[PDB]
Design a protein around this ligand. Structure first.
Ligand SMILES: CCCCCCCCCCCCCCCCCC(=O)OC[C@H](COP(=O)([O-])OCC(O)COP(=O)([O-])OC[C@@H](COC(=O)CCCCCCCCCCCCCCCCC)OC(=O)CCCCCCCCCCCCCCCCC)OC(=O)CCCCCCCCCCCCCCCCC
Ligand SMILES: CCCCCCCCCCCCCCCCCC(=O)OC[C@H](COP(=O)(O)OCCN)OC(=O)CCCCCCCCCCCCCCCCC
Ligand code: SF4
Ligand code: SF4
Lengths: 64, 242, 126, 123, 182, 191
């Protein structure tokens, strides 16, 4: 999808004059909508790798 | 103005001149006497504190040794790891030694360290080719590899060990090298057999045989009996003559 | 009742794995009293182990009761920082509970053979 | 903690022959079940039955050993070898150390009576 | 400055730049103090080790009381045959020190009586726990433990009182996670 | 002054052992935009690259070996050699100290009474595939016969050219005698 976004941006850059100030605003709402999904991806932390053998951080407690 | 091209040629600088060198004559063991009396007192405390286990103790030049039996290894190690005065937390080494003249030929040796008090201590047991030894991996995880070594080298079996297997010697090696019955060269050797196309193990044959030269050993006693350094507080009293 | 020996999270002191202990002195006092209890109950009075650990816990406990500052207590108890002192207390207590089951004060279980413990010193063997 | 490897058994010296009987039988069973793996992992030039024959021979070697401690030692050594073989630690040479017979006949004269040994100075 | 630098270039024994190139280097250098590291040919390894004059005057070095020819017997400076014995103490030899005492603090009867008293312990006549229970407070608190009653600690031969260096003397500044102990 | 319980004045912690505290984003004496610029323009990276470039303009250390050799010392230990006296007689007397102290047991000697009534060798071998080049053999000889040359250029295509015999050593000493005299004249006083 990010490749399809950046490839769909090609017509804008090659028609940028003829779509003066209208298609500008249109592509901004386009990019903002796509930035939303990027925001969802980051804050989920999808691309992060997760480790199983965790370092213990409990406390050492002795029953008396 | 100054530069490496105008740098001082130190090679010509005048050098110290000493006419006579004065080095006093001194024994290196007079340095140790007070520490030795201290180690004797500490060992005496430990023997009084664990009479069930400690058979004896020796001292020699800021080195202590405690003699025990295979049953007493885990308990004494717990004392030496957890007691306040003896926080011997680090495991420096494990070693076996072969004394075939004994019934129990092997003599396992633990060395220990206390970074807290800045001291080392030893701990000796005994074993046989069939009588095992308890493993202190329950306490010191670093003993894992050292006990695997002592097994592979001498054949001692460390009971309770999660994975006791050879570590140094070849994967199919049959024998325990550092035994005094094991010949230097071993029993086998390897070559490439062009026929089978495989590294193959064959009986040993050397093109120059081993020459020992331990037959030139001295016939005269080289270093006579030493010198007592026991503190007088640990010498068995002489009764007054009358 | 339960006690906190070692915080494995929080503010780090200069050692790794050890972290600042909130309210150490009460924990030290409870652990010292529990060690004295196990010794006074399960161990013989005439055993050197008991007397040694008793004087040790009593003296460390006095240094913990009279003093309030931890830096001072550390300069008096010559065993690391106070968060290491609590761990020494815990280890001593568990050793007491273990030694109550074993019987170190008893007489020798295995007596070595005469051939054992002879090392190249008998003047007539080599 | 330094954890044990795959097929590791903790060294435990049984006090009786009746338990070691069972442990030895489990070891023999594992060797047999794993013999095809010993044929795949090591590029072997003979049969799985011949491997099982050699295994039976190696267990018949010490069939008549009545001292308990020596039996415990033998069992521990055998479990070591099973761990060495099933995990692909050994290479082909260290494994075919156990199969001299399968390799081609070494020459012609293999003395078996006195006179040949004398002619070869092996008596 | 401190006792450990920084030091300029004209005291470092390296092959540097000369002329306008030095002005350019001191301009374009992160630290103009620094050296190229190539040694100075006239000095380094000159004269060559196989042509040192000092080898003709050289004589085997010595120390006075060991080179003395008259009152220098070997049996006084034989430190090998004076080696300290490996002492051994089994429970027998320790209970005698307990039931009896030592040459420094005797508690033994005179005559053949005390001799056989030693003999009773040389053999299994009295045990270590028996004489641990037969030991008065002055014995334990003064020969097993301390006079104060506390057990002895693992002795140190050469004690080390540590000290911390912070700030400017330290090897690294404050921010870094390493410190410096004297 | 002080009485200690399972402790000491050495094992008491250092005065300042307790590290102060980790600093947070607050209590940061460097504004957010400054460390942001260092974060986005890769400052320390450019600095390291410049320290790399300054080396690009400095003298390389390399030498051309076959035309320029590296430093060599009289104490150096390379190939072996058996020397002679100025008379032309060989120095070896078969004391067999070189055969005894040698760690690797490379040396192999066999002597007998020479026709002129003297003690001399008929066999002196060195397996340079057993040799570790320790120099204990040039140290034991009480006549300075066996030596170790600075030569290191004696590689071969076969392993049997390395089982040096007496003749191969006597010629090697006839060859390198001038170099051996330099090294001996500047090494003997210390040896
Ligand atoms: C097509 C291929 C042709 C390639 C051959 C080019 C030869 C050539 O043009 O010589 C120019 C010649 C190079 O100088 P050089 O004669 O070889 O330097 C010898 C000195 O002894 C140098 O004295 P030095 O050993 O102390 O080195 C000083 C050095 C020190 O350089 C630095 O420290 C500057 C650090 C690099 C800065 C990078 C900025 C880019 O500065 C330079 O040498 C010039 C570096 C530029 O003249 C110039 O300086 C022109 C610079 C352009
Ligand atoms: C001539 C060529 C010279 C350049 C060669 C560079 C070689 C490759 C550089 C490798 C990148 C450095 C790196 O290791 O990146 C990872 C690093 C991770 O840091 P992080 O996970 O985010 O932790 C945050 C808490 N500090 O995070 C970073 O360090 C990334 C830093 C940004 C990377 C460069 C961005 C360049 C674009 C500049 C845009 C400027 C506008 C943004 C606002 C700047 C405000 C001044
Ligand atoms: S220097 Fe070389 S030849 Fe001489 S003893 Fe050592 S290894 Fe052997
Ligand atoms: S030490 Fe010297 S003299 Fe003696 S055998 Fe060796 S080479 Fe010959």
């Amino acid at each position: 999808p990010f490749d399809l976004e950046i490839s769909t941006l090609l017509p804008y850059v090659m028609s940028i004059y003829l779509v003066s100030n209208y298609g500008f605003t249109i592509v901004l709402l386009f990019l903002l909508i796509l930035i939303i999904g990027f925001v969802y991806e980051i804050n989920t932390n999808a691309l992060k790798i997760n480790k199983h053998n965790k370092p213990n951080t409990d406390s050492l407690i002795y029953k008396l | 103005a100054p530069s490496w091209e105008n740098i001082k040629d130190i090679r010509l600088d005048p050098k110290v001149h000493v006419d006579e060198v004065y080095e006093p004559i001194v024994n290196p063991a007079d340095r140790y006497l007070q520490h030795v009396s201290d180690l004797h007192q500490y060992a005496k405390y430990i023997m009084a504190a664990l009479p069930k286990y400690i058979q004896g103790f020796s001292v020699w030049k800021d080195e202590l040794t405690l003699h025990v039996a295979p049953s007493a290894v885990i308990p004494v190690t717990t004392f030496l790891r957890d007691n306040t005065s003896t926080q011997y937390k680090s495991i420096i080494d494990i070693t076996a030694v072969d004394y075939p003249s004994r019934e129990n030929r092997f003599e396992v040796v633990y060395n220990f360290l206390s970074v807290r008090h800045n001291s080392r201590i030893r701990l000796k047991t005994y074993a046989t080719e069939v009588t095992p030894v308890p493993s202190i991996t329950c306490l010191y995880e670093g003993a894992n590899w050292f006990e695997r070594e002592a097994y592979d080298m001498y054949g001692v079996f460390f009971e309770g060990h999660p994975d006791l297997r050879r570590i140094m010697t070849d994967y199919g090696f049959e024998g325990h090298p550092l035994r005094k019955d094991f010949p230097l060269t071993g029993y086998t050797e390897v070559r490439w057999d062009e026929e089978k196309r495989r590294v193959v193990y064959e009986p040993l044959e050397l093109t120059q045989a081993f020459r020992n030269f331990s037959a030139g050993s001295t016939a005269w006693e080289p270093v006579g009996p030493g010198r007592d350094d026991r503190p007088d507080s640990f010498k068995l009293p002489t009764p007054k003559p009358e | 009742q339960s006690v906190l020996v070692q915080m494995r999270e929080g503010t780090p002191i200069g050692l790794t794995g050890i972290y600042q202990h909130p309210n150490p002195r009460p924990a030290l006092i409870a652990l010292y009293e529990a060690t004295l209890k196990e010794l006074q109950d399960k161990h013989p009075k005439d055993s050197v182990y008991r007397q040694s650990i008793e004087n040790l816990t009593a003296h460390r406990k006095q240094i913990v009761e009279d003093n309030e500052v931890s830096e001072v207590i550390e300069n008096k108890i010559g065993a690391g920082l106070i968060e290491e002192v609590v761990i020494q207390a815990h280890e001593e207590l568990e050793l007491a509970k273990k030694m109550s089951e074993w019987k170190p004060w008893e007489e020798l279980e295995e007596k070595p053979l005469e051939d054992q413990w002879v090392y190249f010193n008998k003047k007539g063997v080599e | 903690a330094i954890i044990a490897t795959a097929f590791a058994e903790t060294v435990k010296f049984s006090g009786s022959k009746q338990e070691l009987q069972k442990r030895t039988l489990a070891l023999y069973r594992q060797f047999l079940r794993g013999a095809p793996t010993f044929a795949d992992l090591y590029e072997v030039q003979f049969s799985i039955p011949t491997i099982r024959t050699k295994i039976r021979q190696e267990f018949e070697r010490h069939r008549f050993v009545d001292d308990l401690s020596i039996q415990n030692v033998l069992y521990a050594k055998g479990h070591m070898e099973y761990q060495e073989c099933i995990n692909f630690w050994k290479q082909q040479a260290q494994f075919l150390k156990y199969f001299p017979e399968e390799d081609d006949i070494q020459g012609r004269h293999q003395p078996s009576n006195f006179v040949d040994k004398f002619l070869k100075n092996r008596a | 400055m401190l006792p450990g630098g920084p030091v300029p270039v004209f005291k470092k024994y390296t092959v540097g730049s000369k002329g306008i190139w030095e002005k350019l280097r001191v301009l374009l250098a992160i630290a103009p103090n620094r050296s190229t590291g190539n040694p100075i040919v006239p000095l380094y390894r000159v004269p060559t080790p196989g042509s040192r004059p000092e080898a003709n005057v050289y004589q085997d070095p010595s120390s006075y009381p060991t080179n003395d020819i008259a009152e220098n017997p070997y049996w006084k400076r034989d430190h090998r045959r004076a080696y300290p014995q490996t002492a051994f103490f089994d429970q027998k030899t320790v209970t005698g020190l307990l039931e009896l005492g030592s040459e420094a603090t005797p508690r033994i009867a005179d005559g053949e009586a005390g001799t056989k008293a030693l003999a009773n312990i040389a053999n299994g006549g009295v045990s270590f726990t028996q004489a641990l229970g037969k030991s008065s407070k002055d014995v334990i608190y003064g020969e097993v433990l301390t006079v104060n009653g506390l057990p002895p600690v693992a002795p140190t031969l050469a004690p080390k009182q540590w000290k911390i260096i912070e700030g400017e003397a330290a090897i690294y500044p404050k921010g870094y996670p390493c410190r410096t102990f004297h | 002054i002080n009485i200690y319980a399972g402790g000491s004045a050495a094992a008491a912690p250092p005065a300042g052992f307790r590290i102060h505290r980790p600093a947070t984003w607050e209590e940061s004496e460097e504004g957010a935009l400054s460390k942001a610029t260092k974060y986005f323009l890769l400052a320390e990276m450019f600095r390291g690259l410049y320290v790399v470039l300054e080396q690009f303009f400095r003298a390389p250390y390399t030498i051309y070996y076959p035309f320029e050799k590296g430093p060599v010392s009289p104490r150096f230990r390379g190939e072996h050699a058996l020397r002679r006296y100025p008379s032309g007689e060989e120095r070896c007397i078969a004391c067999k100290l070189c055969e005894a102290i040698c760690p690797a047991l490379a040396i192999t000697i066999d002597a007998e009474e020479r026709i002129d009534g003297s003690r001399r060798t008929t066999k002196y071998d060195i397996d340079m595939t057993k040799c570790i080049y320790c120099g204990y053999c040039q140290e034991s000889c009480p006549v300075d016969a066996i030596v170790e040359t600075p030569n290191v250029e004696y590689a071969t295509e076969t392993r049997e050219e390395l089982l040096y015999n007496k003749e191969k050593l006597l010629a090697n000493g006839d060859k390198w005698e001038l170099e051996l005299q330099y090294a001996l004249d500047a090494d003997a006083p210390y040896r």
